[PDB]
Design a protein around this ligand. Structure first.
Ligand SMILES: O=C1CCNC(=O)N1
Ligand SMILES: [Ca+2]
Ligand SMILES: [Ca+2]
Lengths: 1277, 86
């Protein structure tokens, strides 16, 4: 009946108050206090109630939109957290998924390791185990140990404790018992059980959710309690509600128990508020757009409902989570984006941010670079007398951008805005075109900041005729608080497939969730005559690894209910990707119940006013628009919109100046003001005049579109794939090519497909020739015609327009099995024919007609036919999608324009790489001969690797003379595709780093040109046919690491010390009798990372050429017959230095059935990881069957098909890296942390580093008196 | 195949779990048609020198059937008499 909503953004505080019978809406804002968030809400309420003259005791409900929990996790300003976890897994929050954020960087630090929420000194272990799938107790709980660990945590001074055991979502009795011990021994400690925060599987994501919860728990619990107790003293007798990131109210008590759901809340309110203003006029389909000061938030609401984001995309800053969130696209192109031409002569805006501190110099603030917002001033969209209420400070400041491009005086500003428009529009079209949305039906809605500026421009590109702006864009966040309804989410993990399902267990699971939902609603005193309950489910095809959420019908679960739910899955899949699989089984993973309580809908406030243009017309200043490309200045008036009434539909180019927003209407079109205060502008979609564009803009538009096509085809292929190597390792490549085969656009998904796609398409062109027709689909994997290695299979489709070949679209990924000599992986084999099936430009669809017999023959020759068929379908779908997006610009601009735009980016890439190679002094750079362990067929004999690097001019050559001859195993590297690809990748890493280098250079044909690799025929790096090249990874890893050691004397700042430069690529496989199928698990064990000159080396992460993700343990134990019994950091210290070398992991996998094991190992009995500038050397790996038990065997690095029976375990120990610099110059304040964490021992701290740590007052501290003495007498010895 | 038998068809087969001796022996079957009516089959089979398996020629120490080489499962060589070049 009487409701208020308060939202706190970070500078301003917005308050909205509405009434049903009185029909009064009050708008009020109040300045916010950043140091104390409580003193901004209370004061706000005090200002709201006094103006209207109402009492707080009459409010039915109030909603709060704070963001304190976000700023605590982002700035890492929370509490000391302890962890009681299963013993042997003490390092899970350290490992993460072992994937770096960036694929092509060497100077990047992992945020979860560098600033961890639970430090390693406070992570403790308890001996017990609970096993899937039923939840039996394998190891009994010891009662003395748990109490001792709790008391240790209490003595240290731990404020919050996060209990995180494996499989606690299955049965939580161990965590419950631990909690009941904790509360009685440590009453004043925040406690979080992982089972009660998110009872779902995936242990890293669940423990990270729990650890974030426990990290921000003590802070926001205090803030919420203070807010509730202070509001009650004012007179508020009810309970306060809190807005979550999924859309929904939740009371204070439950909000203090799950703070993790409050983080990143407030962009969601904008989308819901936009839906509210859109449904007044009558449009159900909405596209909301908010351009703020730094970023742009985009939200697409089809028919008027929210869209939940993908699991992989759910992350708070850098840490993952499993909290439900609304899919909102954040784009860097906002108010703070700098416009510049780089050294390669290319126009780009962003992603470097200017900030609000410098500001535009025309307003009189002080700046030194051209900004996105300063471009709006030049054209006249923003008045130069708005904030205040030099003039040429903007025109003359862009001289360093205008004349340097060949632009006109006034057209420079237009370019900077059009580039942002297109960047946002292809972001939208990525998530609009494949979804199957007709843009004419939709409506664009603006928001606060600068949202209405790009409204008609973007709608023209999308072809959207309706543009709507709400009555007050500056409060849409507050209004969207009140539009949503109080709902509770209760979830469970309940894995079933529709093939073998029971309509009684499912009903009981949903009834359990319903029981707890009704019990939650009983405590809030809500009548039973208004409780609406909706059921949902997360499902996926069998073989995939991520789910889609969709609404299932109302209960009870009957026989027809199953059919309706299975149909709803296909409807929700088709709507997200745009493809329909021809087979496969659907399985539900998680179930959800939302118990909504619709109390009353928010009515539109109908108020009427009177006015005209003549009331507030102040003056007329010149304003510049785009007239068919040319800049023509024209007259423009200014007046406030708070003076006109309803039906004041007037024409003329005018600029509306509201207190919070701006609305500028294009000339020649009128804007209708409806009764509700909204405006509907008749924006043009199809017009009769062709406009002009400058040279810098046209290249970026087509290039960005080809780029977006590459990344869109990548995401479709990898999200829909059945293969785990394509899905988790991201071992794929995709992009668009021209007639000659030169790549124009590439997905950049993995370093393993660097420059290898052009070789694939050129290899196809050279074997087919003119035998290229329309509707053709081509398979290719030949490693002597450009492929990386046999298991990666590529699909190419010709592109035709009016019977003329214009290009190609291509996608490639690694299958699980290709029908080779061993399941999965292989080392000890004869030649290339032993590797499996080779495809040599085999065409899949002749003239568009599917050759059923050819598809069937291919699918009969693999051990995993269901997975392989799924991967073929996903690759064909991504190529179809890219062909569509290419023909779109062929029709839009022209065939010659598309060919020319593709040629421009090749020479941009080449120019940028050559400028960097030319700066290194010319010469010949050498190093020590590296060694590899035996080939595999004959143990003992080492294999040398010599890398010499020659630099002459703007060209670089890698000479591998002196490397070994061909070995008769698969332990060789393909020259074009692997050797050239790896040295192209290390060149890009060395000179074009993602972190240090300012701009991101796309992967085209121009990167492949400025380097050459000379490797004599008949070596391991350039073998003669028919040598097998299946196992290629470790050789090129060591080769590029030796290339780093060779160039270390001249380039220290862009290299690293001795990396592990290895892989332990494992294949565990067996035959499942019940399913009648092979089960294959392919594991990529991460290595470690040698130190750098400026920062230490991250432990436990995929190194150099690899950037894979691990499979979660709980998913593995549900899917395969195994049990990971240990996964942590190795015990011995790794390597000393000024910056420490990285530590490897020791993973102990035990097995429950007879399994076969193949390993691609390296660095067991051979050369140690090196160090630099006097840094120590790392350690070699090992492979031991049954550590500390009966049957220990010291396995070599590379094995092929060794058997394990049952109860056997493999202890895989991976190498540790080397250090960089002399250990005697390390910081004294850091070795203290290293000893307590367990990185290095106390006895070996005086020798290598030379720091004396003495125990004083119980605690260990660094003494600055005896440290300087020891450093003197440590050089001579 | 069943009723998926047309004139001018040529069929390749070597599956040892569907009647073959062992993988290296590959068979060719051709349907015989008279007045649009199936009347019989003609068939020939022999051992190739190499079938693209794990080792050249012969093999003993290998994993399973998929490591023996290529499996043909009633593959049509000539659909309706026209040669499938690809
Ligand atoms: O997953 C991976 C890592 C090693 N090599 C490869 O081809 N894929
Ligand atoms: Ca691969
Ligand atoms: Ca024979």
């Amino acid at each position: 009946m009487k409701r208020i909503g308060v939202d706190v953004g970070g500078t301003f505080t917005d308050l909205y108050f509405s009434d049903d019978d009185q029909r009064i809406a009050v708008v009020e804002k109040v300045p916010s206090t950043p140091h104390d968030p409580s003193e901004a809400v209370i004061n706000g309420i005090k200002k709201l109630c006094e103006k209207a003259g109402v009492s707080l005791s009459e409010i039915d409900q109030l909603v709060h939109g704070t963001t304190v929990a976000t700023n605590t996790a982002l700035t890492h300003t929370g509490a000391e957290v302890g962890m009681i976890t299963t013993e042997g897994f003490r390092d899970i929050l350290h490992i993460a998924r072992h994937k770096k954020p960036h694929n092509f960087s060497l100077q990047q630090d992992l945020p979860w390791q560098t600033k961890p929420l639970i430090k390693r000194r406070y992570r403790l272990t308890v001996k017990e185990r609970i096993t899937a799938p039923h939840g039996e107790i394998l190891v009994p709980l010891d009662e003395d140990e748990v109490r001792q660990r709790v008391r240790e945590l209490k003595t240290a001074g731990v404020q919050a404790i996060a209990v995180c055991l494996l499989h606690s979502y299955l049965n939580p009795e161990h965590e419950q018992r631990i909690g009941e011990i904790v509360n009685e021994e440590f009453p004043e400690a925040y406690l979080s059980l992982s089972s009660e925060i998110v009872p779902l599987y995936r242990e890293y994501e669940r423990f990270s959710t729990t650890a974030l919860n426990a990290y921000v728990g003590p802070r926001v619990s205090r803030y919420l309690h203070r807010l509730q107790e202070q509001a009650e003293n004012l007179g508020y007798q009810r309970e306060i509600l809190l807005m979550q990131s999924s859309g929904g109210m939740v009371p204070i008590g439950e909000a203090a128990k799950r703070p993790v759901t409050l983080m990143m809340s407030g962009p969601v309110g904008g989308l819901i508020g936009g839906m509210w203003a859109a449904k007044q006029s009558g449009f159900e389909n909405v596209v909301t757009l908010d351009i703020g000061g730094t970023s742009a938030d985009i939200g697409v609401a089809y028919q008027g409902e929210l869209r939940m984001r993908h699991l992989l995309d759910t992350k708070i800053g850098d840490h993952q989570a499993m909290v439900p969130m609304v899919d909102i696209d954040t784009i860097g192109a906002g108010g703070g984006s700098i416009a510049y031409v780089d050294a390669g002569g290319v126009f780009r805006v962003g992603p470097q941010s200017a900030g609000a501190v410098p500001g535009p110099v025309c307003y009189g603030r002080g700046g030194t670079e051209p900004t996105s917002t300063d471009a709006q001033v030049l054209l006249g969209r923003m008045r130069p007398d708005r904030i205040l209420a030099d003039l040429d400070g903007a025109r003359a400041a862009m001289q360093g951008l205008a004349d340097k491009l060949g632009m006109s005086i006034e057209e420079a500003a237009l370019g900077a805005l059009q580039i942002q428009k297109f960047g946002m529009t292809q972001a939208i079209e990525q998530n609009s075109v494949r979804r199957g949305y007709d843009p004419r039906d939709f409506t664009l809605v603006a928001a606060g900041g600068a949202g209405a500026l790009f409204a008609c421009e973007i709608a023209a590109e999308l072809e959207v005729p309706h543009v709507l702006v709400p009555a007050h864009p500056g409060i849409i966040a507050g209004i969207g608080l009140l539009a949503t309804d109080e709902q509770y989410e209760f979830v469970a993990t309940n894995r079933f497939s529709f093939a073998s399902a029971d309509a009684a267990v499912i009903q009981a699971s949903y009834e359990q969730l319903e029981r707890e939902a009704n019990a939650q609603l009983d405590a809030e005193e809500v009548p039973a005559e208004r409780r609406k309950i909706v059921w949902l489910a997360d499902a996926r095809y069998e073989g995939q690894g991520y789910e889609i959420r969709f609404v299932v019908p109302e209960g009870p679960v009957t026989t027809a209910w199953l059919d309706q739910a299975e149909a709803a899955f296909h409807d929700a899949h088709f709507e997200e990707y745009g493809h329909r699989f021809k087979g496969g089984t659907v399985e539900v993973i998680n179930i959800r119940v939302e118990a909504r309580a619709v109390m009353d809908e928010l009515p539109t406030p109908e108020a009427t006013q009177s006015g005209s243009l003549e009331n507030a017309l102040v003056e007329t200043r010149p304003v510049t628009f785009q007239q068919a490309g040319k800049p023509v200045t024209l007259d423009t008036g200014f007046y406030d919109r708070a003076k006109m009434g309803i039906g004041t539909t007037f024409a003329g180019p005018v600029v509306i100046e509201q207190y919070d927003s701006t609305t500028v209407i294009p000339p020649g079109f009128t804007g209708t003001v409806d009764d509700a205060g909204n405006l509907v502008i008749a924006c043009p979609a199809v017009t009769q005049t062709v406009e002009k564009l400058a040279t810098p803009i046209l290249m970026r538009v087509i290039g960005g579109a080809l780029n977006s096509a590459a990344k869109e085809m990548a995401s479709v292929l990898f999200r829909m794939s059945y293969s785990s190597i394509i899905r988790e390792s991201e071992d794929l490549g995709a992009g668009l090519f021209d007639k000659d085969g030169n790549v124009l656009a590439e997905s950049d998904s993995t370093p393993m497909f660097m420059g290898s796609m052009p070789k694939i398409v050129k290899g196809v062109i050279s074997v087919l020739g003119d035998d290229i027709h329309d509707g053709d689909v081509i398979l290719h994997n030949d490693p002597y015609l450009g492929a990386t290695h046999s298991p990666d299979v590529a699909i190419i489709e010709p592109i035709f327009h009016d019977g003329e070949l214009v290009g190609f679209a291509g996608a490639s990924g690694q299958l699980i099995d290709n029908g080779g000599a061993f399941s999965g992986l292989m080392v000890d084999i004869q030649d290339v024919q032993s590797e499996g099936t080779i495809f040599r430009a085999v065409k899949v669809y002749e003239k568009g007609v599917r050759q059923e017999s050819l598809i069937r023959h291919i699918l009969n020759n693999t051990r995993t036919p269901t997975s392989n068929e799924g991967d073929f379908q996903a690759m064909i779908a991504a190529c179809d999608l890219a062909k569509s997006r290419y023909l779109a610009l062929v029709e839009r601009y022209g065939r010659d324009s598309v060919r020319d735009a593709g040629q421009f980016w090749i020479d941009y890439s080449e120019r940028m790489l050559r400028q960097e190679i030319a700066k290194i002094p010319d010469g010949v750079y050498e190093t020590e001969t590296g060694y590899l362990d035996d080939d595999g067929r004959n143990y003992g004999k080492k294999l040398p690797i010599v890398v010499k690097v020659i630099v002459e001019g703007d060209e670089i050559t890698y000479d591998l003379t002196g490397s070994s001859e061909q070995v008769p195993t698969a332990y060789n590297c393909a020259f074009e595709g692997t050797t050239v690809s790896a040295f192209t990748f290390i060149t890009r890493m060395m000179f074009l780093d993602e972190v240090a280098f300012p701009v991101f250079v796309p992967q085209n044909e121009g990167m492949l040109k400025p380097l050459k690799v000379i490797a004599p025929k008949g070596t391991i790096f350039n073998p003669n046919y028919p040598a097998a090249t299946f196992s290629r990874f470790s050789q090129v890893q060591r080769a590029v690491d030796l290339a780093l050691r060779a160039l270390a004397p001249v380039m220290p700042e862009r290299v690293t010390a001795g990396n592990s430069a290895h892989i332990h690529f494992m294949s565990y496989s067996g035959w499942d009798e019940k399913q009648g199928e092979y089960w294959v698990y392919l594991e990529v064990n991460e290595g470690s990372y040698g130190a750098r000159q400026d920062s230490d080396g991250p432990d436990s992460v995929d190194n150099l050429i690899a950037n894979t993700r691990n499979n979660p343990i709980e998913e593995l134990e549900w899917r395969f017959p195994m049990r990971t019994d240990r996964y942590e950091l190795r015990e011995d210290p790794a390597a000393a230095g000024e910056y420490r070398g990285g530590i490897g992991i020791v993973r102990e996998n035990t097995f429950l059935e007879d399994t076969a094991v193949t390993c691609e190992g390296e660095r067991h009995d051979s050369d140690v990881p090196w160090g630099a500038y006097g840094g120590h050397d790392g350690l070699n790996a090992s492979l031991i069957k049954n550590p500390g038990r009966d049957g220990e065997e010291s396995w070599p690095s590379k094995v092929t098909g060794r058997q394990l029976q049952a109860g056997d375990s493999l202890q895989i120990t991976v190498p540790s890296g080397g250090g960089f610099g002399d250990p005697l110059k390390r910081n004294p304040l850091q070795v203290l942390e290293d000893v307590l964490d367990g990185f290095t021992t106390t006895e070996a701290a005086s020798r290598d580093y030379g720091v004396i740590l003495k125990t004083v007052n119980g605690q260990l501290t660094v003494d600055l008196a005896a440290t300087a003495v020891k450093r003197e007498n440590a050089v001579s010895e």
